Design a protein around this ligand. Sequence first.
Ligand SMILES: [Zn+2]
Lengths: 267, 7
Amino acid sequence: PSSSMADFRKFFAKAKHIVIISGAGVSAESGVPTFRGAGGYWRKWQAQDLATPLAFAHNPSRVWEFYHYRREVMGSKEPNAGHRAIAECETRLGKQGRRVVVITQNIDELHRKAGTKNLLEIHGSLFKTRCTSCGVVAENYKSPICPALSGKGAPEPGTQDASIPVEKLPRCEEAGCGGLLRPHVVWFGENLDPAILEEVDRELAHCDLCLVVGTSSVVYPAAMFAPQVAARGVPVAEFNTETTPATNRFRFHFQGPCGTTLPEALA
Amino acid sequence: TARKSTG
Ligand SMILES: [Zn+2]
């Protein structure tokens, strides 16, 4: 792949429909750990061992402790230069009749906070619940989400489980339902929303430039989106602190923190 | 294809 910023910017000048795919690396500079770097451990586990319906089936208190911790940490976090460059790019191009869409694997909502409008949150949101009984999806920013979680979620190895009885975890308040809530987050082994996937496929099929930013490109189906676009002959530029298994499929690779490279690229 | 996996 080319590291020519000038060649990328020639495509960027002409592009009518840009898809920006992001992962946890785009939020690293807001002081939010990635999943596979740092930093990624919560007590003894990584996200892949907790973000699963089997963890939730057999220890919903532990899974809730993890998501609670993340919710409370994320409340104080701010968009960084990469999130702003992405939002500002969308705004500026929109006034020219040019489309920019963000397809994010992040559930942190920082793209929303940055000012991105055309946002596809393909793994859900830290700040939404879904009821395991009635299926209702609700926005939830309550701190703490339920009283039993107050002061819980401490991330240090050696921290004891809160072991909250299931009745005292977050419960559904729709129509007296009372059902156990889960995070409205896509877990390993679970299907992404088919309606979201249909929107993604239409953006990928019609875009004429693609950036893939801060993702390890190992989680599917997301990891195949930018390669799909590249394989149509459309230029794809990867922005990452390192190379990934997808790097060689792409037209461009810009190594470095995306809070530096994205403002330059999208200027 | 629609399942979150690694992949
Ligand atoms: Zn319910």
